[PDB]
């Protein structure tokens, strides 16, 4: 982002992104072609694309800042539950739309979620996204920023799909409640062990097939599963229920975004403005 501008006649604000030109980067190819198909109130809107001989311009709707900066600004102040609930509800709507349109985001992290002064939150940065097929093929391995990376990716699964984004969203949910990353690993194996120490080391009962995964090792320490009331202490019964379903080990049992929209946690959801000035 190198330029922004408010429209006089409307008051609407836009942002200008630039890409200098192996030709057009595959990340740009995917980001642009997929964003053109993803018009939703909780997905950052691509307004226009301008090609020049050595530069590619993208015009986006403008949003004030990202969730990471917001949480850091609120590092010592609780983010009110209604706002956490509203943000999660909106993120699930944006993600369900992506999945229903055969797009995996594959880099959901607070830095890639943009917020405004009206209480909206939107998915951004689709540079790492991909259009998937049904059923899925093997795609790029080791995707997703480490702290938000699902265990099936860490264990080298031949196949992954929509569940990987739900895992990341579960991590972000927890992080909004504490302002601290749920699984802050220092390496792939440390990441895996942080997950295991929290959710228990998975076995064939909890996750059929897990012991046959390419990067599973029988030497893995066997940690016991702890209660979610200890994982995210301030979270209420409904919140813990939802979080536990987003962090299910087995990707086939992990809750979908559209199913999550009907969870009792959202029974009293509203759309409050942020508790801090942006």
């Amino acid at each position: 982002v190198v330029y922004k501008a408010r429209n006089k006649l409307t008051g609407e604000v836009v942002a200008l992104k630039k890409i200098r030109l192996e030709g057009v980067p595959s990340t740009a190819i995917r980001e642009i072609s997929l964003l053109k198909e993803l018009n939703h109130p909780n997905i950052v809107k691509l307004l226009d694309v301008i090609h020049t001989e050595n530069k590619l311009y993208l015009v986006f709707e403008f949003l004030h800042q990202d969730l990471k900066k917001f949480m850091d600004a609120s590092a010592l102040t609780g983010i009110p539950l209604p706002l956490i609930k509203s943000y999660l509800f909106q993120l699930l709507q944006g993600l369900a739309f992506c999945h229903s349109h055969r797009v995996l985001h594959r880099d959901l992290k607070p830095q890639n979620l943009l917020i405004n002064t009206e209480g909206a939150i939107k998915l951004a940065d689709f540079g790492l996204a991909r259009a998937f097929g049904v059923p899925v093929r093997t795609y790029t391995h080791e995707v997703v920023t480490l702290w938000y990376r699902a265990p099936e990716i860490l264990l080298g699964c031949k196949y992954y799909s929509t569940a990987v984004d739900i895992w990341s969203l579960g991590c972000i949910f927890a992080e909004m409640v504490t302002r601290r990353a749920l699984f802050p690993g220092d390496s792939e194996i440390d990441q895996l062990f942080r997950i295991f120490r929290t959710l228990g080391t998975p076995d064939e009962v909890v996750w059929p097939g897990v012991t046959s995964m390419p990067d599973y090792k029988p030497s893995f320490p066997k940690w016991a599963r702890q209660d979610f009331s200890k994982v995210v202490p301030p979270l209420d019964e409904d919140g813990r229920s939802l979080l536990s379903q987003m962090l299910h080990y087995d990707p086939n049992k992990r809750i979908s975004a559209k199913a999550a929209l009907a969870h009792p946690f959202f029974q009293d959801v509203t759309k409050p403005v942020p508790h801090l000035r942006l």
Partner: protein
């Protein structure tokens, strides 16, 4: 050497081909911004930089 390595419809005039491709304002009017030069233009969009 591999069988896939082949020309289909003969040699081309590179100068002419490059010319025809080098050939390839309406957006500049829409956004009041000069993209080729990376410069804002006076207009209904007020281009505050970063």
């Amino acid at each position: 050497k591999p069988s896939a390595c082949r020309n289909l419809f003969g040699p081309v005039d590179h100068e002419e081909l490059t010319r025809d491709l080098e050939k390839h304002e309406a957006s500049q009017r829409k956004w009041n911004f000069d993209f080729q030069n990376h410069k804002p233009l006076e207009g209904k969009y007020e281009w505050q930089e970063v």
